[PDB]
RNA sequence: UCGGAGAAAAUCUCCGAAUGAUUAUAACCUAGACUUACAAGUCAAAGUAAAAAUAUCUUGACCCAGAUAUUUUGAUCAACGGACCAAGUUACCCUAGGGAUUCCUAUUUAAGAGUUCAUAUCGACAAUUAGGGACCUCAUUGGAUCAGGACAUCCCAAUGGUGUAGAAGCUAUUAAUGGUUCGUUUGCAACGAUUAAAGUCCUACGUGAUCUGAGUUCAGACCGGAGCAAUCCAGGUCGGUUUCUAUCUAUUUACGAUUUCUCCCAGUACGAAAGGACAAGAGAAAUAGAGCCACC
RNA sequence: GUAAGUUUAGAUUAUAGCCAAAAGAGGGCUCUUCUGGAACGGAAAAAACCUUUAAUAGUGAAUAAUUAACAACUUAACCAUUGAGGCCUAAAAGCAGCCACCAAUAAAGAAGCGUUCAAGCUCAACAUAAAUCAAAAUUCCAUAAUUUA
């Protein structure tokens, strides 16, 4: 159990940032239970306090601990009113761990996730692994001969007249700041 | 919106593809039958030009072209507006005598004897 | 006007120049090019001539006037492609035209309030693809008549919950039924006396070919403040004329009621007292609708 | 693959677009660049979306696009055994509070909670049987319809 089990404080003062698949904080580091971002959104300091206060009160110092998986607010906002921390879909906002089962932390993590600015979910190591396995399984066993990548990459049907350059990389999974899970 | 370069993998066939379309990877066919089946209106200007270069100004009228890389390069530009079918010569190339008796079938066969009579 | 740096080439972010000092004094001539609407602006082999190669570093036309004896010089012409030389004001105005005329509220969450007890009544952080509102400055809407409609319900009606004993209340569901007053000071409010209640909004201030007060806003005139004056001020004030015979559409001949108070049940049920019901039942009015004339 | 291009001579008009899509720059809008469009058909009406090489007569034919589409996953009825574990609130009982995190047993640690604290209402044991998702304001506004290859 880390000595500083409780969440630390966050300093108030130190378009594509949330428009694609995440490349950071996508893997569990120390904890087993964490909140997974399912969309792109900006986390201002107010959200940070809600996560800090709610999680700290419930967690047991003897058996539980938590850590932050995202940087403090650094991006300027003007009417320099305040700074917002960008987050990409797939990021782990906060990580929890300890000699506890997922079910114990499900309620608090899910409650915290609901109040986040973007859609989010509470996932353990197993659940995150299961989600990826299901995604790969769906792609392999898909019975639709046509897929977004092949049509877009090969410019079949003259499709690229109606597509953005970024669409080829995303392959239709991501539209704007929203992530479509079922879309293979 | 700019011209696109298709990855080379698109034009590398697979063993099942040869089975489906019935074309041997060896002894490749010589001549294409190309017909325009979509309109050049609302298409970028480069597509409009290649269609005129290939002679496919009228739709649903077939044109014969060489199955050589330079011709193929233009065809790849307008792949979506045309239908490419391999010309077949069941009875061989037309000679001087048979030049006036030919007919191009929908199947892709240029028959050199056209009688308009029951097969019997 | 031009030059330097960023954005990175459309508008934005910054610095400088209308030269400066140094000097070897840096010639004439002539291929090919850059740049460029025009105009202006760049680089330069070869040849010749001086010397014994070198100018180094960081911009204004034409005309017209000059100066010398060919050679040259004239712009905060800076509104910087530059009229040789001209400012205010107009509400007395005119013509040609172009225009316009944070805070609620509904959901989700629930630390903390509520002695105890999250959700009787509420409530931090937040969540709704959720609904409405250079130094100075500032400008359509009342009323009358007749109202159509929404329901996010002010009263009337039917109900759930309570920290609902009764009586008073609080909260929520349902319902658009008919109703929802008269004045005073007011220019927006500010009060008085009532009521079962004096709802919140939409209809181009709903409605000016139905009517009316402001305002926009002028021709006259004063103060206060500007300006040398004419004049001026989004500062005061007093005065001050918009007419219309309806062509078309549309419209112009019934209904089957709302509310309040008193009486009774009963000063009972309830309640320590204080105080004080419901339904059931009878009678009065007020208003609205439809009619009538024996009386007044 | 294809038929255009340079130069010479002459010449006006034009110099305010419009909407969709794509990438940026400022900061929803607004500038800049790239692509397309101007139906008589379809999207309801529909300049700007999709289908459409010109324009002719015909009581022929094959076709294109074509506002339509088919809520989502374990309590069953049962049983609960001390020295009050101490100490800070007489003393604090699974249990005011804090720390041990406790007792034998076929089998039970104290879960809610009760309790001034113990009242004890009784969870888990023993002991019995089965068991996460995908179509507000004039007056509603085509009519209808679940299966014939
Ligand atoms: Mg020139
Ligand atoms: Mg030389
Ligand atoms: Mg000028
Ligand atoms: Mg100029
Ligand atoms: Mg006057
Ligand atoms: Mg009405
Ligand atoms: Mg209602
Ligand atoms: Mg009128
Ligand atoms: Mg009249
Ligand atoms: Mg006068
Ligand atoms: Mg007057
Ligand atoms: Mg008078
Ligand atoms: Mg006046
Ligand atoms: Mg009339
Ligand atoms: Mg009664």
CA of A93 to C1' of C280 (A): 69
Task: Establish how many alpha carbons lie within 13 A of residue A64's alpha carbon, considering only the half-sphere containing its beta carbon.
Answer: 18
A176 CB less than 7 Å from any atom of strand C: no
Beta pairing class for A120-124 and B31-36: unpaired
Identify whether the C-beta of residue A162 lies closer than 8 Å to the C-beta of residue A156.
no
In terms of Cα–Cα distance, which of B79, B41, B37 is closest to B62?
B37
Q: Please, what's the b/e burial string for A37-76 (b: 16 or more CB within 10 A of its CB; e: otherwise)?
A: bbbbbbbbbebbeebbebbeeebeeeebbbbbbbebbeee
CA-based nearest distance B81→chain A, Å: 8
CA dist A55 and A180 (Å) reads 29
CB-based contact, A161 to chain B, within 8 Å: yes
Q: State which approach was used to obtain the coordinates.
A: cryo-EM
- Residues in B closer than 8 angstroms to A155, CB to CB, are 4, 6, 79-80
- Give the CA dihedral A57, A9, A44, A101, nearest 10 degrees: -40
SS (HEC) of B12-80:
CCCHHHHHHHCCCCCCCCCEEEEEECCCCCCCCHHHHHHHHHHCCCCCCCCEEEECCHHHHHHHHHCHH
Q: Which residue has the tokens 């490749």?
A: B28
Identify whether the C-beta of residue B63 lies closer than 8 Å to the C-beta of residue B56.
yes
Task: Establish how many alpha carbons lie within 13 A of residue A72's alpha carbon, considering only the half-sphere containing its beta carbon.
Answer: 10
CB-based contact, A157 to chain B, within 8 Å: yes
Q: Which residues fall within 8 angstroms of residue A32, CB to CB, at 6 or more apart? A: A96, A97, A102, A124, A125
In terms of Cα–Cα distance, which of B27, B16, B24, B10 is closest to B79?
B10
Taking CA atoms, A92 is separated from A6, A128, B12, B84, in Å, by: 18, 10, 41, 51
CA dist B108 and A5 (Å) reads 77
Q: Which residues fall within 8 angstroms of residue A96, CB to CB, at 6 or more apart? A: A31, A32, A33, A34, A55, A59, A64, A65, A66, A105, A109
Residue A38: alpha-carbon gap to chain centroid: 5
Residue of A nearest to B38 (CA): A157
Edge-to-edge strands of the sheet including A41-44?
A41-44, A82-87, A75-77
Six-digit token string for A106:
């499900």
- Give the CA dihedral A15, A17, A22, A23, nearest 10 degrees: 140
Query: Which nucleotide lies nearest residue A50, CA to C1'?
Result: C125
CA dist A172 and A143 (Å) reads 18
CA-based nearest distance A180→chain B, Å: 25
Identify whether the C-beta of residue A34 lies closer than 8 Å to the C-beta of residue A69.
yes
CB contact under 8 A, A153 and B80: no
How many angstroms separate the first and last alpha carbons of chain A?
A: 40
CA dist A47 and A117 (Å) reads 8
Q: Classify residue A174 by its DSSP letter.
A: E
Alpha helices in A22-124 (DSSP H): 45-58, 102-114
CA of A58 to C1' of D123 (A): 23
CA dist B43 and A63 (Å) reads 66
Give the mutation candidate from B2, B39, B44, B80 for the A interface (greatest A CB count, under 10 A): B80
Taking CA atoms, A55 is separated from A62, A80, A148, B68, B112, in Å, by: 15, 29, 41, 69, 86
CA-based nearest distance B114→chain A, Å: 37
CA dist B78 and A154 (Å) reads 12
- Residues in B closer than 8 angstroms to A161, CB to CB, are 1, 43-44
CA dist A39 and B78 (Å) reads 38
Q: Provide the phi-psi class of B5: left if phi over 0, else alpha when psi is between -120 and 50, else beta.
A: beta
């Amino acid at each position: 159990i880390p000595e500083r089990s409780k969440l630390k404080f966050v300093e108030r003062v130190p378009l594509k940032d949330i428009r694609g698949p995440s490349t950071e904080a996508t893997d569990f580091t120390e904890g087993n239970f964490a909140i997974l971002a399912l969309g792109g959104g900006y986390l201002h300091w107010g959200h940070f306090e809600m996560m800090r206060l709610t999680i700290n009160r419930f967690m047991d110092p003897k058996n539980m601990f938590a850590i932050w998986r995202v940087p403090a607010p650094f991006k300027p906002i003007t009417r320099i009113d305040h700074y917002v921390t960008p987050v990409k879909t797939g990021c782990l906002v906060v990580e929890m761990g300890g000699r506890c089962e997922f079910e114990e932390v499900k309620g608090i993590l899910n409650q915290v996730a609901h109040k986040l600015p973007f859609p989010a979910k509470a996932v353990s190591r197993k659940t995150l692994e299961r989600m990826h396995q299901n995604q790969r399984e769906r792609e392999l066993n898909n019975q639709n001969p046509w897929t977004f990548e092949h049509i877009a990459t090969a410019n079949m049907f003259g499709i690229r007249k109606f597509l953005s350059p970024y669409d080829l990389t995303q392959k239709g999974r991501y539209w704007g700041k929203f992530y479509m899970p079922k879309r293979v | 919106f700019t011209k696109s370069r298709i990855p080379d993998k698109v034009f590398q066939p697979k063993p099942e593809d040869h089975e489906k379309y019935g074309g041997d990877p060896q002894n490749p066919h010589k001549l294409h039958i190309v017909t325009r089946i979509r309109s050049t209106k609302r298409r970028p200007y480069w597509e409009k030009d290649t269609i005129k270069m290939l002679g496919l100004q009228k739709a649903h009228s077939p044109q014969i072209h060489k199955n050589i890389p330079s011709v193929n390069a233009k065809l790849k530009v307008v792949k979506h507006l045309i239908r490419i079918q391999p010309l077949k010569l069941p009875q061989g190339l037309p000679t001087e005598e048979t030049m006036s008796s030919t007919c191009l079938k929908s199947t892709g066969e240029l028959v050199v004897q056209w009688h308009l009579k029951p097969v019997e």
